[PDB]
């Protein structure tokens, strides 16, 4: 069909990236397809960061379609900040392409040690215009306007190591990715893909919470006060000065997480947020959760949640859609 | 872990 498909390759079944191209000469890059941000960036040839020494860099001189800008800009993520300047060149995703304003990152030190430990060169934001720095229209919105795709929407079907690969589909909804039918939840703001849901972590509840659906986040996040209470009665231990929480794999008290809207319910069984630490000793398990204080009631449903539910991001409907993923 | 924009 006309839908533009982009494969999502799995790495140590903890993260996934996809391929993207910049420039008329088509320089390739491994990118994080991040619904939690709205800017695109690839490490620049002019980047002196040690991290850049092992990454695919972008050479703007090798592209005749390159439009110089120069404006300086920084992008701050929960995991760190990157710096560089704007440029504009041809951007290629799957079989679609288009001139798009992006950032050439020349400084990645504050994204370490993550940046060099994992494998991705840059990040492609899939959020909304107001979530971007530089008022940039989402590329999927761009493509739809330029009639290169049927609908201004995209979907995420995450991979499962040694089972199947995942796919970022742009343009339409492919029924082979999920079971049953898709239910939608209207966004409370066209910034992140954020909706209202009553959060239920066992007996702990936060009604009408603000929930962000983010493919670029590898855990489930909750406000500190709420998550610390949660871990309190569940015998969850925090490794000192480290974003890691563990408990016993045989802990039968870890509840099924519940996210309810007026009409729908989304759950996440413990199997989706617990992992044995050692590959030979299954005594202790890691809890895929992390305290993040954006505000008093904001939660981030990252990959653990998306490995269970196929997701649809519809700009026109200004909604996020959910359904059980196949396999 | 990773948390992608403020």
Residue of B2, B5, B6 with shortest CB distance to A38 = B5
Best CA proximity match to A34, nearest among A175, A212, A211: A212
Query: Does A1-175 match A176-327 in CATH topology?
Result: yes
Q: Which residues of B touch A (CB under 8 A)?
A: 2-6
**Which tokens in the block code for residue A62?**
């090798």
Strand pairing partners for A83? Answer: A74, A107
Radius of gyration of chain B from its Cα atoms, rounded to whole angstroms = 6
A34 catalytic? Reply is yes
Residue of chain A minimizing CA distance to B5: A77
Q: Are B5 and A36 an interchain contact pair (Cβ–Cβ within 8 Å)?
A: yes
User: In this structure, are residues A325 and A308 in contact, taking their beta carbons and an 8 Å threshold?
Assistant: yes
Structure-determination technique: X-ray
Q: Which CATH architecture has domain A1-175?
A: Beta Barrel (2.40)
**Which tokens in the block code for residue A135?**
């008022």
Q: How many CB atoms lie within 10 A of CB A276?
A: 13
Residue of A32, A76, A292 with shortest CB distance to B4 = A32
Spatial separation of the C-alpha atoms in residues A219 and A215, rounded to whole Å: 10
Domain ranges of chain A: 1-175, 176-327
Spatial separation of the C-alpha atoms in residues A274 and A117, rounded to whole Å: 22
Best CA proximity match to A123, nearest among A97, A142, A104: A104
A298 prior amide bond cis, ω within 30:
no
Q: How far is A51 from chain B (nearest CA, A)?
A: 17
The DSSP code sequence of A60-106 is GGG-TT-EEEEEEEEEEETTEEEEEEEEEEEEEETTEEEEEEEEEEE
Exposure string of A303-317, with b = 16+ CB inside 10 Å and e = fewer, is bbbbbbbbbbbbbee
- Resolution of this model in Å is 2.5
Best CA proximity match to A20, nearest among A170, A162, A121: A121
Assigned CATH topology for domain A176-327:
Cathepsin D, subunit A; domain 1 (2.40.70)
**Which tokens in the block code for residue A198?**
């009553």
């Amino acid at each position: 069909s006309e839908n533009d498909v982009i494969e999502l390759d799995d790495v140590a079944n903890i993260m996934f990236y996809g391929e993207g191209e910049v420039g008329d000469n088509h320089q390739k890059f491994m990118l994080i397809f991040d619904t939690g941000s709205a800017n695109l960036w690839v490490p620049s040839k002019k980047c002196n960061s040690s991290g850049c020494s092992i990454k695919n860099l972008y050479d703007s001189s090798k592209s005749k379609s390159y439009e110089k800008d120069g404006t300086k800009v920084d992008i701050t993520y929960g995991s760190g900040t990157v710096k560089g300047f704007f440029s504009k060149d041809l951007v290629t995703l799957g079989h679609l392409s288009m001139p798009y304003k992006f950032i050439e990152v020349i400084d990645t030190d504050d994204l370490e040690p993550i940046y060099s430990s994992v494998e991705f060169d840059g990040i492609l934001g899939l959020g909304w215009k107001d979530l971007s720095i530089g008022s940039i229209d989402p590329i999927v919105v761009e493509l739809k306007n330029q009639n290169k795709i049927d609908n201004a929407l995209f979907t995420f079907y995450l991979p499962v190591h040694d089972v199947h690969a995942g796919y970022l589909t742009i343009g339409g909804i492919e029924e082979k990715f999920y079971e049953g039918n898709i239910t939608y939840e209207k966004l409370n703001h066209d910034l992140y893909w954020q909706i209202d849901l009553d959060v239920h972590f066992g007996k702990q509840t936060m009604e009408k919470a603000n929930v962000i659906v983010d493919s670029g986040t590898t855990t489930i996040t909750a406000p500190s006060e709420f998550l610390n209470k949660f871990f309190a009665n569940l015998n969850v231990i925090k490794v000192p000065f480290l974003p890691f929480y563990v408990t016993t794999c045989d802990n039968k008290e870890m509840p099924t997480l519940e996210f309810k809207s007026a009409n729908n319910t989304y759950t996440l069984e413990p199997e989706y947020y617990m992992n044995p630490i050692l590959e030979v000793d299954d005594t202790l398990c890691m809890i895929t959760m992390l305290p993040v204080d954006i505000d008093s009631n904001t939660f981030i449903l990252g990959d653990p949640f998306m490995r269970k539910y196929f997701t649809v991001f519809d700009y026109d409907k200004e909604s996020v859609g959910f359904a059980i993923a196949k396999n | 872990x990773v948390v992608x924009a403020x």
